């Protein structure tokens, strides 16, 4: 299985920058090896929802509209590793962030589906 464990969250500032990192690790049980990345949030009073996402090759990735601009998602060159750069942090922001990998190829990544793994969850407050 993919082990994915996450770090970099924590306290800030609106305005502020942070960087939140997903290493990852093991085989996967489905698909021919690869798999796509994705962040999700968990918002106090709110349902889950995805913030961004990129294929495994990295030709496409997709943000959650009120992240485009500010947000990138990016993978290093050798790879386990997944990166999420928050920049202009605005307090919406508060929440607890989550990184989960994607065995199996999807034709529309804006779609919620095929997470199979999921990381462990980094808080992230922007104070004012
Ligand atoms: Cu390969
Ligand atoms: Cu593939």
């Known amino acids: 299985q993919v082990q994915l464990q996450e770090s970099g969250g924590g306290l800030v500032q609106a305005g502020g920058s942070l960087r939140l990192s997903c290493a990852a690790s093991?085989?996967?049980?489905?698909?021919?090896?690869?798999?796509?990345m994705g962040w999700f949030r968990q918002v106090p009073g709110k349902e889950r929802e995805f913030v961004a996402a990129?294929?495994?090759?990295?030709?496409?990735?997709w943000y959650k509209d009120s992240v485009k601009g500010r947000f990138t998602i990016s993978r290093d060159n050798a790879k386990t590793t997944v990166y999420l750069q928050m920049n202009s942090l605005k307090g919406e922001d508060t929440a607890v962030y989550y990184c989960?990998?994607?065995?199996?190829?999807?034709?529309?990544?804006?779609?919620?589906?095929?997470?199979?793994?999921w990381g462990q969850g980094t808080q992230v407050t922007v104070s004012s």
């Open positions: 093991g085989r996967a049980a489905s698909g021919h090896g690869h798999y796509g």
């Open positions: 990129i294929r495994w090759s990295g030709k496409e990735t």
């Open positions: 989960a990998a994607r065995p199996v190829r999807v034709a529309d990544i804006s779609l919620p589906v095929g997470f199979d793994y």
